[PDB]
Amino acid sequence: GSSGSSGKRQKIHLGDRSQKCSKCGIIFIRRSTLSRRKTPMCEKCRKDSCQEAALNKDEGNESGKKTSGPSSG
Ligand SMILES: [Zn+2]
């Protein structure tokens, strides 16, 4: 550990995409998502979609978002 040449390796990009949530009001990065609600919700809130009615959670089903090409083999 020692002071060397001025910091060169810099990979800092702009930060606009960042959107302010409406439910909680946290700062997050809006990413590709299937338009469902007409409001800026952060990943955190999104999870609380309030859909899971039954106490159960998952009995052998891994919810996967649309991906390039179907799933076959
Ligand atoms: Zn939120």
Side-chain angles (χ1 to χ4, degrees):
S2 169
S3 194
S5 289
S6 78
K8 172 156 191 183
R9 285 200 289 202
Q10 193 188 121
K11 290 82 185 278
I12 302 162
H13 56 92
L14 210 77
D16 166 70
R17 277 151 210 177
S18 68
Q19 198 75 321
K20 166 155 270 161
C21 186
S22 190
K23 177 164 173 200
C24 71
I26 195 174
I27 300 292
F28 72 86
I29 306 286
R30 271 195 299 158
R31 59 79 161 82
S32 280
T33 189
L34 270 305
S35 287
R36 177 158 69 199
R37 302 173 90 82
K38 195 80 183 66
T39 183
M41 295 210 111
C42 65
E43 285 188 27
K44 181 154 274 161
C45 288
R46 293 210 179 84
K47 280 168 77 77
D48 197 21
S49 68
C50 197
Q51 181 281 358
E52 303 296 328
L55 269 292
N56 199 51
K57 288 150 189 160
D58 290 67
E59 59 202 300
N61 196 292
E62 195 199 327
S63 56
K65 284 163 79 275
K66 285 153 209 208
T67 188
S68 75
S71 276
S72 185

